[PDB]
Design a binder for this molecule. Structure first.
Ligand code: NA
Length: 129
């Protein structure tokens, strides 16, 4: 599923991301834009052999199992394919764990490089929320 911007914002809000760990909804929408272009099916292989999965590009070395990432953990206790669903529940649940890990949203490189410090509230402007 390719979400619309406001559609994603609404879904993230219902599933409890808005202000989660102090990160406003705009931060999470911005992160998804630059991680996946709002595409739940997005996958990208990293140089270390791990792969990033789904709307928030959650990585197989620490958080999910894809069966092909040597010496990795599955801290979200989910198959990585569960992060590709049109239903964002598994991605949201796992992202909550990630953002609680110690470095906050800096765990998402695209968030650090493209969202952090910017006018992130623009990502939810005009949305019925
Ligand atoms: Na893993």
């Amino acid at each position: 599923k390719v979400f619309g911007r406001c559609e994603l914002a609404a879904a993230m809000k219902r599933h409890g991301l808005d202000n989660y760990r102090g990160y406003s909804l705009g931060n999470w929408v911005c992160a998804a834009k630059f991680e996946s272009n709002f595409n739940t099916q997005a996958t990208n292989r990293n140089t270390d052999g791990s792969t990033d999965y789904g709307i928030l590009q959650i990585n197989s070395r620490w958080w999910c199992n894809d069966g092909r990432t040597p010496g990795s953990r599955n801290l979200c206790n989910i198959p990585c394919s569960a992060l590709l669903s049109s239903d964002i529940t598994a991605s949201v649940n796992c992202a909550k764990k990630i953002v609680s890990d110690g470095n906050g949203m800096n765990a998402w490189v695209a968030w650090r490089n493209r969202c952090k410090g910017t006018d992130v509230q623009a990502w939810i402007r005009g949305c019925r929320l």
